[PDB]
Design a binder for this molecule. Structure first.
Ligand SMILES: Nc1ncnc2c1ncn2[C@@H]1O[C@H](COP(=O)(O)OP(=O)(O)O)[C@@H](O)[C@H]1O
Ligand SMILES: Nc1ncnc2c1ncn2[C@@H]1O[C@H](COP(=O)(O)OP(=O)(O)O)[C@@H](O)[C@H]1O
Ligand SMILES: CC(=O)N[C@@H]1[C@@H](O)[C@H](O)[C@@H](CO)O[C@@H]1O
Ligand SMILES: CC(=O)N[C@@H]1[C@@H](O)[C@H](O)[C@@H](CO)O[C@@H]1O
Ligand SMILES: [K+]
Ligand SMILES: [K+]
Ligand SMILES: [Zn+2]
Ligand SMILES: [Zn+2]
Ligand SMILES: [Zn+2]
Lengths: 304, 306
């Protein structure tokens, strides 16, 4: 008999949801992520909670999915695509402002948790939730339970470096080596995300187009976009084949902005086998069943 | 009467190790034979003989669990085992079930190792354990909340067949880096770099002499120039590659097994070198040498049948 709030915080947008005691979604809000000012970042979150509390006449529970890691010892955030939040004790800061406990979990973990709880995936021995947004994130579920890892880093596939076969595709010593918000270089976060898709286009063609614009040019059969999409589909297959040789997930669920690129679901099953072991069988690869809400739902229900 | 007996096999490229464990799980037999490398019939014979002999010795029909490098196809049961040429492409489980007239369980070697190591009372309650074999190849066994994740197609933990990451290539000279062919038929898999065999191949690549890992390590201990250069390069390469793996898996405990796990310097150097390549907020896992020595494979295989 509560109200449960969830936040799904990404590099560019914050999604907010409120769910009643029967878990029905009764609020839905979206705001831009403040990426520069930490004060503005906190304000955005606090406003949404306060507004919802005023609307429903309650003090809602607060679960937040963050695009990054709260240090397991200090609580300070590493959010590679949110400069504003870097180094701050988000949980503590919010508990102060909102005068109640706050649970923080990684965004991809929340997404994976929600998607794995779907009746269709109940009973699957493993599920990998993959977010391809401003960054690349993974949530690892084994027998229905999240593996969050020794230091809340499990599933941080975005901060693994391009594998040799991917570098080969991109031209080896001539490959674009993109800087990462984690301060490393060549992290796949900057290649397979919708942002990375854009950066790869710009690197090869010297024009700053959005992912939806490139995809639209692709749909028209425009030469540069067709070349870009071929390169990207192969890069995606190579990188995910490496990850699947380590993790071998039963089901892979894709979320984030770039998960709306329908071609991915056609091309991945065709391109993965060449890069997997000979006896590998493909995982079930599906688009998010909860649309754009799995992160919010996962976050909200941390307080269940 | 003897009671229930559990047999385990650790099948390697050169030798087959057998163990029989009684109902109290005490090891009461230990046998080692050459791995038949050509004839599959000879391979099966070696295994069947050990089971039959042990059965005759103890007056029982023991359960049979087998650890082997490579993968039994999840659909066909055919083995993908590049390092066991005799068994490649064969339905080992079915063939043995016919010969031995009882069920046979087949598991990956690194999975067996991880299962045995994680069952230790001190690890049994850890939220995750990664068993890593550094031997002729590089293999991983992934345990989450005390249960092995064997994966969609029995491939979970095949970290040896992931390709060198960019930061590792950079260390090795990028377009001038040695790109070793792999038994899986890919190129640049870490199986051929971080294993004891890989350690040797890297030495040979840079120095053109085919020394064994123990020879190189002994030269290193004497401060010989080439070995010192090799070991520095290798320690950094190992840290880079494992940092990539740990950023994906973030294991609570990592247990090292296989021949190269005997190189003690690894346990000193990894904690020093990993942080630079991990995320800023990463905390190191507990990194330990195998608590069961060279026996975790046999024990893990035997106890598949517990
Ligand atoms: N329908 C779409 N098709 C393809 N790419 C999209 C689509 N919507 C958003 N994107 C891209 O996804 C990225 C943004 O990721 P998203 O998950 O929306 O949020 P966040 O920035 O919070 O991670 C951008 O590259 C954006 O252009
Ligand atoms: N004590 C040791 N110190 C260092 N390396 C070792 C040691 N013993 C074996 N090795 C190396 O480990 C590799 C052998 O792998 P091992 O685990 O013995 O068998 P398998 O071939 O079944 O994996 C070889 O490179 C060997 O030289
Ligand atoms: C260290 C870091 O910032 N990682 C985040 C990751 O947690 C998140 O899941 C992903 C997608 O939003 O983007 C980033 O890679
Ligand atoms: C595909 C293949 O042969 N992989 C094996 C792996 O199963 C084993 O665990 C590892 C260590 O023995 O060596 C190889 O990497
Ligand atoms: K994660
Ligand atoms: K394995
Ligand atoms: Zn990074
Ligand atoms: Zn390989
Ligand atoms: Zn010598």
């Amino acid at each position: 008999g509560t109200m449960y709030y969830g936040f799904d915080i990404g590099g560019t947008k914050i999604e907010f949801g409120a769910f009643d005691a029967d878990l029905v979604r009764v609020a839905r809000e979206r705001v831009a992520t403040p990426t520069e000012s930490y004060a503005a970042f906190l304000d955005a979150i606090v406003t949404l909670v306060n507004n919802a509390d005023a609307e429903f006449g309650v003090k809602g529970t607060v679960g937040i999915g963050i695009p990054g890691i709260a240090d397991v010892e200090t609580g300070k955030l590493l959010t590679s695509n949110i400069p504003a939040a870097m180094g701050h004790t988000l949980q503590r800061d919010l508990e102060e402002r909102l005068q109640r406990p706050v649970k923080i979990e990684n965004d991809a973990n929340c997404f994976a948790l929600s998607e794995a709880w779907d009746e269709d995936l109940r009973g699957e021995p493993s599920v990998l939730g993959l977010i391809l947004g401003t960054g690349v994130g993974g949530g690892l579920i084994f027998n229905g339970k999240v593996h969050s890892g020794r230091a809340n880093i499990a599933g941080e596939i975005g901060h693994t470096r391009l594998p040799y076969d991917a570098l080969k595709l991109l031209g080896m010593e001539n490959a674009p080596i993109f800087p990462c918000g984690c301060k490393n270089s060549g992290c796949i976060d900057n290649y397979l995300s919708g942002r990375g898709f854009e950066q790869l286009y710009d690197h090869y063609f010297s024009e700053k187009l959005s992912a939806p614009e490139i995809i639209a040019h692709y749909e028209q059969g425009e030469r540069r976009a067709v070349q870009h999409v071929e390169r990207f589909m192969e890069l995606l297959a190579i990188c995910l084949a490496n990850i699947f040789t380590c993790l071998d997930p039963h089901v892979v669920v894709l979320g984030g902005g770039l998960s709306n690129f329908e071609l991915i679901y056609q091309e991945l099953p065709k391109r993965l086998p060449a890069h997997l072991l000979h006896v590998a069988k493909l995982p079930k690869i599906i688009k998010a069943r909860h649309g754009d809400a799995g992160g919010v739902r996962g976050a909200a229900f941390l307080n269940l």
